[PDB]
Amino acid sequence: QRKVWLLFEYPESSQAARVVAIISVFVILLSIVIFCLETLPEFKHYPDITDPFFLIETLCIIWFTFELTVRFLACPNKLNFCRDVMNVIDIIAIIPYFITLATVVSLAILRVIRLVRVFRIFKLSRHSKGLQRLGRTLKASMRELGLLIFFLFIGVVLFSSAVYFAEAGSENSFFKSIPDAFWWAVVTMTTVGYGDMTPVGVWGKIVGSLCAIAGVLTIALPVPVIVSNFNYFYHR
Amino acid sequence: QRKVWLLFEYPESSQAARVVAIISVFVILLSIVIFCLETLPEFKHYPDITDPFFLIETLCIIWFTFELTVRFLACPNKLNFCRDVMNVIDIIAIIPYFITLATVVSLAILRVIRLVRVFRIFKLSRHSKGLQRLGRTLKASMRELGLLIFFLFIGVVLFSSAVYFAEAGSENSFFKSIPDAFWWAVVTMTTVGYGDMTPVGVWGKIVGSLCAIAGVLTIALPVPVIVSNFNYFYHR
Amino acid sequence: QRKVWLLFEYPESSQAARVVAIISVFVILLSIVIFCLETLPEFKHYPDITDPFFLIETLCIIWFTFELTVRFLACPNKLNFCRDVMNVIDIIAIIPYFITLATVVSLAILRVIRLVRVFRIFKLSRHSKGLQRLGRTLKASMRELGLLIFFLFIGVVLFSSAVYFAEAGSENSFFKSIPDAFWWAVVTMTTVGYGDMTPVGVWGKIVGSLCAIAGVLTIALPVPVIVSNFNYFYHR
Amino acid sequence: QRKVWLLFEYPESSQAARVVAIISVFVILLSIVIFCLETLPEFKHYPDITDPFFLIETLCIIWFTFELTVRFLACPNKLNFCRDVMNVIDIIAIIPYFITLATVVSLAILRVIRLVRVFRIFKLSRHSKGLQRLGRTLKASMRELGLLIFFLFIGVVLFSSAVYFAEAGSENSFFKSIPDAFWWAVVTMTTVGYGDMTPVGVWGKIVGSLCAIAGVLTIALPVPVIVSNFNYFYHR
Numbered sequence: 001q002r003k004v005w006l007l008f009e010y011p012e013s014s015q016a017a018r019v020v021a022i023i024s025v026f027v028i029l030l031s032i033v034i035f036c037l038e039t040l041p042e043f044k045h046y047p048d049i050t051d052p053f054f055l056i057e058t059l060c061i062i063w064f065t066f067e068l069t070v071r072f073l074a075c076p077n078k079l080n081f082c083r084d085v086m087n088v089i090d091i092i093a094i095i096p097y098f099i100t101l102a103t104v105v106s107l108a109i110l111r112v113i114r115l116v117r118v119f120r121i122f123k124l125s126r127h128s129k130g131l132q133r134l135g136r137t138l139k140a141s142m143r144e145l146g147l148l149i150f151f152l153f154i155g156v157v158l159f160s161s162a163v164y165f166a167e168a169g170s171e172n173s174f175f176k177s178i179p180d181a182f183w184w185a186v187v188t189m190t191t192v193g194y195g196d197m198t199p200v201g202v203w204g205k206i207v208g209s210l211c212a213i214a215g216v217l218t219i220a221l222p223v224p225v226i227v228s229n230f231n232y233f234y235h236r
Numbered sequence: 237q238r239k240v241w242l243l244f245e246y247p248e249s250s251q252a253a254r255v256v257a258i259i260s261v262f263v264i265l266l267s268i269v270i271f272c273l274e275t276l277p278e279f280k281h282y283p284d285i286t287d288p289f290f291l292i293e294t295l296c297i298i299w300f301t302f303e304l305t306v307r308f309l310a311c312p313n314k315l316n317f318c319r320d321v322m323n324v325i326d327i328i329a330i331i332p333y334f335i336t337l338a339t340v341v342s343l344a345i346l347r348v349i350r351l352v353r354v355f356r357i358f359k360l361s362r363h364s365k366g367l368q369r370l371g372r373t374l375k376a377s378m379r380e381l382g383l384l385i386f387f388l389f390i391g392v393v394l395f396s397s398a399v400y401f402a403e404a405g406s407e408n409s410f411f412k413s414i415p416d417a418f419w420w421a422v423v424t425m426t427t428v429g430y431g432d433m434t435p436v437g438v439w440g441k442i443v444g445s446l447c448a449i450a451g452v453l454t455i456a457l458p459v460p461v462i463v464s465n466f467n468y469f470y471h472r
Numbered sequence: 473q474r475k476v477w478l479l480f481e482y483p484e485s486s487q488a489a490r491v492v493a494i495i496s497v498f499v500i501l502l503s504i505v506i507f508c509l510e511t512l513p514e515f516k517h518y519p520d521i522t523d524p525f526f527l528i529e530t531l532c533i534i535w536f537t538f539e540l541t542v543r544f545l546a547c548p549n550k551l552n553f554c555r556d557v558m559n560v561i562d563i564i565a566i567i568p569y570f571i572t573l574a575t576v577v578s579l580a581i582l583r584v585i586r587l588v589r590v591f592r593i594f595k596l597s598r599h600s601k602g603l604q605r606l607g608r609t610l611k612a613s614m615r616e617l618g619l620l621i622f623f624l625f626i627g628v629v630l631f632s633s634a635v636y637f638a639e640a641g642s643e644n645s646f647f648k649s650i651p652d653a654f655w656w657a658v659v660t661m662t663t664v665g666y667g668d669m670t671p672v673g674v675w676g677k678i679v680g681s682l683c684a685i686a687g688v689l690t691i692a693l694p695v696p697v698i699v700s701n702f703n704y705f706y707h708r
Numbered sequence: 709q710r711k712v713w714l715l716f717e718y719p720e721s722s723q724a725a726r727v728v729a730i731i732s733v734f735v736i737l738l739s740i741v742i743f744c745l746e747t748l749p750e751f752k753h754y755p756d757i758t759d760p761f762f763l764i765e766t767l768c769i770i771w772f773t774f775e776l777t778v779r780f781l782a783c784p785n786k787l788n789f790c791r792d793v794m795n796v797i798d799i800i801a802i803i804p805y806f807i808t809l810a811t812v813v814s815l816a817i818l819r820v821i822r823l824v825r826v827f828r829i830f831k832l833s834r835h836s837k838g839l840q841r842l843g844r845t846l847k848a849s850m851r852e853l854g855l856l857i858f859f860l861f862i863g864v865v866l867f868s869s870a871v872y873f874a875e876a877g878s879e880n881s882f883f884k885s886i887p888d889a890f891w892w893a894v895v896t897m898t899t900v901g902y903g904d905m906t907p908v909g910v911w912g913k914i915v916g917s918l919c920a921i922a923g924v925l926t927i928a929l930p931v932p933v934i935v936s937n938f939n940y941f942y943h944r
């Protein structure tokens with residue numbers, strides 16, 4: 001039990017453990033590539049047993065379930081294994097296949113279950129030493145970042161309402177309502193700035209200028225929040 | 237008096253005070269949602285007693301006025317109650333309902349008062365300690381932010397003048413005048429960058445490149461201003 | 473001499489000096505507003521004595537020349553009066569009127585001399601206490617800003633070359649040559665991001681992705697340069 | 709040998725050394741300008757001996773090869789000469805001419821070798837005192853910048869998948885597949901924001917809003933990484 005546990009959990013234990021970690025990384029990358037390529041227009045049909053993409057998916061899922069079963073059996077205690085995030089992300093990454101397999105042997109639910117496979121990238125943090133530190137740094141500042149998001153929501157509602165009320169007098173305005181102007185306000189406060197929605201009126205232009213100024217303010221506001229978490233997790 | 241105080245003002249004093257604060261936050265959120273929703277194209281008519289949006293608005297306004305009256309009567313000092321901003325934001329948020337009610341029982345004046353109701357968001361700062369801290373941090377750096385805004389205005393005027401004078405030789409130019417170029421210059425100095433207004437001439441392109449460089453400078457500039465206020469209120 | 477000095481130069485000396493400084497600020501603002509408003513299509517025709525804009529310009533120029541002559545006569549040293557930038561910005565701002573007046577009593581030369589009036593904003597630095605400090609902060613980091621501009625130029629040339637050579641295989645590409653791609657590359661490295669020029673090819677999209685990443689790098693790069701100048705002039 | 713080595717690679721050795729460095733900078737700039745101007749439509753043909761754009765190239769390449777040969781012959785040892793980056797970049801800068809010359813005396817391969825001439829800019833680092841410091845600062849932070857790029861890739865894959873799956877129900881959507889959405893997700897996470905690809909659905913707009921928020925996060929992320937490298941290489 002301990003031997004296989006250190007073989008599958010500690011890649012630095014031996015060369016075989018490093019090989020296992022490398023093959024796990026390769027399988028994760030292959031599954032991600034297959035998931036991305038499956039949606040290409042020239043590959044989709046208008047699934048089945050003979051589909052090569054299906055075969056690669058079965059191989060990846062078989063490896064994932066074998067690794068998960070081995071780790072669960074070799075875990076020192078079941079509660080810790082079931083409570084660890086790096087294992088819950090793995091158990092979420094396998095269920096969408098099994099739901100699909102049951103139908104082989106309503107479209108609204110099909111929209112989300114096929115989506116959940118994107119989380120396959122998340123066990124890369126296990127094998128990436130730097131990514132664990134980055135995740136810890138992000139988590140340590142999650143409260144202040146949430147507060148910043150709340151402030152951004154306040155500003156986005158303010159500017160959306162202002163621009164809609166200043167643009168109500170234009171017959172060709174894109175802003176039909178504040179819920180419609182939310183997209184523009186959040187794409188302005190965060191400095192992306194698509195050309196698909198811009199004010200045309202003078203008052204709308206003034207409100208947009210104020211929103212752009214607030215966006216300049218808010219693109220630099222979380223910088224001190226990132227500091228004192230970064231430069232802090234690297235020296236101690 | 238003192239019984240209903242520390243209860244309508246201090247949620248942490250008792251469970252009843254926490255319940256009152258929670259219901260106040262819920263009413264604020266409901267009023268904000270109703271304000272944003274009522275202008276949707278499928279909801280607006282082309283007000284009245286039977287309108288459900290009107291009923292929810294009356295409920296929210298009744299709760300707001302009851303809370304404001306209770307707080308005013310229970311305050312230990314009438315002088316500072318009016319001077320406090322957290323109460324002026326409350327008293328502004330109730331006026332537009334009463335103006336609307338009088339007409340039920342110049343159109344430009346009607347649009348601004350309707351916009352005034354959007355200040356309902358600001359009472360959320362009372363129940364959010366983090367928002368109070370963020371507001372204090374922003375207020376502590378108001379003067380330097382104003383200086384930065386003045387510098388941005390100087391740059392925006394300079395670049396609008398430059399781009400208009402460089403673009404005067406093009407018959408298809410969007411920049412008809414310096415006020416027209418103001419929108420583009422403030423959209424460039426801020427890194428939003430809409431595609432609705434771009435120079436087409438070579439000299440216009442050079443001026444736009446210089447404006448973009450100055451925009452990188454002007455949004456990388458207020459970072460140290462936010463610092464020494466953040467990381468300062470959280471450490472002292 | 474010394475009586476009108478410390479009065480035309482030091483507003484804080486007496487109430488009369490403060491009044492003179494206030495009237496100078498008002499004249500500068502009026503001249504700037506008139507300059508911006510003169511180019512509006514409604515006011516422009518398709519100059520003369522009876523033009524109200526011309527009258528306001530003559531009043532502003534008369535005040536400027538009177539103030540400059542008084543300051544020059546009252547200065548204790550003629551050598552440094554010309555060398556000081558706050559006086560050279562004044563002396564450029566008066567020239568365009570005199571050139572225009574001579575014609576009333578090659579068109580490319582006419583557009584630049586009209587343009588150079590934009591520098592009327594810069595005398596506001598004399599009467600703004602914080603603008604001088606901000607200018608000193610910017611000047612103290614001029615060399616590193618120039619280094620950053622040189623790096624940005626290197627990156628812009630590299631990415632323009634890459635995108636043009638990866639996009640020449642498309643008949644509908646906007647990039648006709650490296651100078652054409654310069655505009656897109658400097659619009660991408662700076663995070664303005666206009667939609668007027670975007671790659672359409674796959675290789676063009678990859679090069680654009682790399683340019684956008686380098687743009688994030690180059691917009692986050694000058695922040696430490698602004699620091700150690702800001703927070704340095706405010707503490708020492 | 710040592711005398712000419714000091715004359716060539718040490719611009720501070722004498723006035724002649726400074727002259728040699730200046731002429732090398734001038735030749736590099738001339739080659740860059742010629743390379744950029746060669747692709748202009750007014751100059752391209754639809755090469756030969758009489759082409760002036762070929763003669764300037766021959767002169768630049770002759771100077772480059774003379775300098776390279778002199779430096780190689782005057783070097784103290786061959787290993788460091790062939791291992792130093794500022795010399796290997798010179799090696800890459802001369803080969804493309806010789807390949808072109810052979811043909812005068814598979815088309816895609818002929819195009820990439822033309823592209824690789826862009827590296828002519830990189831010899832400017834030798835003669836720029838501050839560019840070496842900037843390169844050292846960038847190199848010292850390359851390990852963490854790679855991790856940041858990896859995080860950006862994870863986020864870009866996640867958001868591309870989310871936006872494609874949310875936008876699958878729209879017949880007019882621009883997102884045909886996850887690789888198509890990769891361009892938009894990069895353009896969003898980096899705060900550039902072209903208007904060529906935007907979601908139109910409500911769920912697509914929500915996913916785009918989340919991607920923009922994460923883009924603000926990822927543009928604020930690398931600032932602390934640049935610090936502790938800057939302000940560190942310039943003080944010790």
Ligand SMILES: [K+]
Nearest residue numbers: 191427663899
């Ligand atoms: K931006």
Ligand SMILES: [K+]
Nearest residue numbers: 193429665901
């Ligand atoms: K943009």
